[PDB]
Amino acid sequence: DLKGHSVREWVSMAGPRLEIHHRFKNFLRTHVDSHGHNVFKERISDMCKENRESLVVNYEDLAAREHVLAYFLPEAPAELLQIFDEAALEVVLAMYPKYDRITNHIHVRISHLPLVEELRSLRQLHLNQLIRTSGVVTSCTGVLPQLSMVKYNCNKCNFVLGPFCQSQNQEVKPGSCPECQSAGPFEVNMEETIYQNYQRIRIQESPGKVAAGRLPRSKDAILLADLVDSCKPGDEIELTGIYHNNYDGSLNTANGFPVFATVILANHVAKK
Amino acid sequence: VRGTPVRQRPDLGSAQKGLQVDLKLVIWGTDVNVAACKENFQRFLQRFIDPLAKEEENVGIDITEPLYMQRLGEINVIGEPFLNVNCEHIKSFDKNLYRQLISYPQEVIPTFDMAVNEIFFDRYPDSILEHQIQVRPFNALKTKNMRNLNPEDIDQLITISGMVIRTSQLIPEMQEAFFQCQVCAHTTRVEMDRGRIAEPSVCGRCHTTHSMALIHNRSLFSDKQMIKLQESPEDMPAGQTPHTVILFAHNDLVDKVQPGDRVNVTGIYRAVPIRVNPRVSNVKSVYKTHIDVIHYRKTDAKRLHGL
Ligand SMILES: [Zn+2]
Ligand SMILES: [Zn+2]
């Protein structure tokens, strides 16, 4: 349901959290097929057969069967994506409870988002929204290891400060050690940490789509944990991701307008 | 053993490793074998009839039956699990077991307890005692003067005699702490182990770090009683003032003896360090010592019967 508050705050409330999580579980189990097949069963079967770690769902099917979620999706994509991670984890564990050792996580990708913006036109009005876009990869660094649930040795006493989740926005920083009570020079325990693959690509508008008097514009993009090395330089790629501003990128330094960089946490990369 | 509870022995002392070593397999630091001491005392239980048992001075003690077996019979007919093991009976029977008990009490005594419980439950299957029988070893060879005791009898069962002065109020102390997770209400008992508790530091259910809080009045407490006692030594050197000694009684012996009562006291001589100041956790080189109590003999051959 809808109220005066914003969509993001709404979906942050626990009542609608349970509402939409239940709805996602419901159509995951019940949206059978165009022609009565229960396609999610077979998709999950192949997903666990390979241990793909990542499911993908069609936005047309999503919106058509259940449209409230589809409308909410570009507004506050991060929260919806986290909940659908949890719900997909529930359903895959239901189908194969043996999956528990397998990555303890499932990502979910959204395909065929209807409204494609163009890299020339991505303004303030798209921040913190899931957009679809096209381009060509001009650069793609190697796969690097990222912290995802990091444990820290308090190097005053070698207590293992527990596994802190690592959001993409700001680097996690423990306050103090629960044992010796010091905000000490903590340092990462290389082993108990469970890292996550991180790759950084840069897409740009294709010259076939650039206009007459122009320079093609380029947007960064971050691939994480399953999409790394899913695209090489020069690949014409569709990218779907949360156009994003609030990580630490900002020209707060001297000699600069108060002007922010941007990225795209890629949620689906599709070569063409 | 049927399954009766093994309630800890606060008066014997804090536990230890019980480290054993081969030279068969003796206890480290001691010339004791668990098997040898256990078997010798089982023999002492099953076959020790008195050479003389004056019925007038020892009512209920015969000259025919084995001595302590009918004591086990009375400990079956009534419910108090305590057996008066006369150390001089042990001296007459087996001098080696005397040496081992009155050199190594806190470890020989649990074996004696094990043997007694084993024999008793073998004899009586359906008898039910609230917990294991405990052996009270007393009338050890009287040391005369505390001021003439030496630093070699620490933790070594001694005996003296004297009059009480004060029996202060009970003092609970921890034996099995209770912890509850502040977040998820997961409970856990933590046994006191060798002189200090183990604060769990992680919930067993929700894994929160240091969310475990110590609920006080759910714990387990044995009691205590400081019992300041004035010695009546039989040896009075030329200017030794009246010696007075602290007695810490525990769960079963507390408030069994009032001020002014005259008692032989057999008990574990126990050095414990002295804190430098009440709040600083340092200690002193120059320990105190205080007799514990394993037994008070009320009876005296010179005095008359007590109240
Ligand atoms: Zn620490
Ligand atoms: Zn808990």
Q: Which residues in chain A have Cβ-Cβ distances shorter than 8 Å to B210?
A: 178-179
Calculate how close chain A gets to B210, using CA atoms only, in Å. 7
In sequence order, which residues have a C-beta less than 8 Å from that of residue A185 and are 6 or more positions away?
A155, A156
Angstrom distance (rounded) from CA B221 to CA B224: 9
Angstrom distance (rounded) from CA B254 to CA B130: 18
CB pairs under 8 A between A and B: 7
Measure Cα distances from A99 to A30, A50, A82, A108 in Å: 22, 12, 19, 16
Q: Is residue B127 packed enough to be buried (19+ CB in 10 Å), middle (13-18) or exposed (0-12)? A: middle
Q: How far is CA A139 from the centre of its chain?
A: 21
Angstrom distance (rounded) from CA B3 to CA B128: 10
- Per-residue tokens: A189: 């325990």
Q: Check the CA dihedral B61-B62-B67-B70 and report its sign.
A: negative
Angstrom distance (rounded) from CA B129 to CA B146: 37
Angstrom distance (rounded) from CA B228 to CA B167: 6
Angstrom distance (rounded) from CA B242 to CA B279: 32
In sequence order, which residues have a C-beta less than 8 Å from that of residue A247 and are 6 or more positions away?
A168, A169, A170, A263
Angstrom distance (rounded) from CA A229 to CA A219: 18
For A:130-169, CB contacts with B below 8 A are 162
Q: Which residues in chain B have Cβ-Cβ distances shorter than 8 Å to A162?
A: 207, 209
- Cβ atoms of A130 and A240 closer than 8 Å: yes
Interface check for A178 against chain B (CB to CB < 8 A): the answer is: yes
Mutate to test the interface with A, among B209, B210, B212 (most CBs of A within 10 A): B209
Neighbours of ion ligand 2 (CB under 5 A): B 181, 183-184, 186, 203, 205-206
- What separation in Å is there between the alpha carbon of B218 and the centre of ligand 2? 18
Q: What is the largest CA-CA distance in chain B?
A: 69
Calculate how close chain A gets to B189, using CA atoms only, in Å. 21
Angstrom distance (rounded) from CA B288 to CA B277: 15
Calculate how close chain B gets to A106, using CA atoms only, in Å. 23
Angstrom distance (rounded) from CA A106 to CA B227: 68
Q: How far is CA B45 from the centre of its chain?
A: 19
Q: Check the CA dihedral B141-B144-B148-B154 and report its sign.
A: positive
Q: Of A186, A145, A172, A151, whose CA–CA distance to A248 is shortest?
A: A172
Work out the angle between the directed axes of helices B67-77 and B105-123 (0-180°, nearest 10).
70
Calculate how close chain A gets to B209, using CA atoms only, in Å. 7
- Per-residue tokens: A223: 């691939």
Q: Which residues in chain A have Cβ-Cβ distances shorter than 8 Å to B201?
A: 178-179
Pairing of strands A187-188, A194-204: unpaired
Q: Find the closest chain B residue to A162 by CA distance.
A: B209
- Residue A138's CB: how many other CB atoms inside 10 A? 13
* Nearest ligand atom owner, CA of A176: 1
Q: Which residues pair with B86 in a beta bridge?
A: B138
- Per-residue tokens: A152: 């820290």
Q: How far is CA B180 from the centre of its chain?
A: 32
Q: In B6-32, which positions are buried (b, 16+ CB within 10 angstroms) versus exposed (e)?
A: ebbbbbbeebeeeeeeeeeeebeeeeb
Angstrom distance (rounded) from CA A250 to CA A156: 35
- Per-residue tokens: B109: 């005594």
Radius of gyration of chain B (CA): 22
- Cβ atoms of B65 and B48 closer than 8 Å: no
Angstrom distance (rounded) from CA B211 to CA B227: 39
- Residue B149's CB: how many other CB atoms inside 10 A? 17
- Cβ atoms of A226 and A198 closer than 8 Å: no
Q: Find the closest chain B residue to A177 by CA distance.
A: B209
Q: Where are the alpha helices (DSSP H) in chain A?
A: 7-12, 14-30, 39-50, 59-65, 67-75, 77-95
- Per-residue tokens: B78: 């009534």
Angstrom distance (rounded) from CA B79 to CA B81: 6
- Per-residue tokens: A58: 């069609």
Question: DSSP character for A97?
Answer: G
**Residue matched to tokens 């004899």:** B123
In sequence order, which residues have a C-beta less than 8 Å from that of residue A14 and are 6 or more positions away?
none
Tell me, in Å, the resolution of the deposited structure. Answer: 3.2
Q: Find the closest chain B residue to A159 by CA distance.
A: B209
Interface touch A162/B210, C-beta < 8 Å = no
φ, ψ of residue B208 in degrees (nearest 5): -65, 140
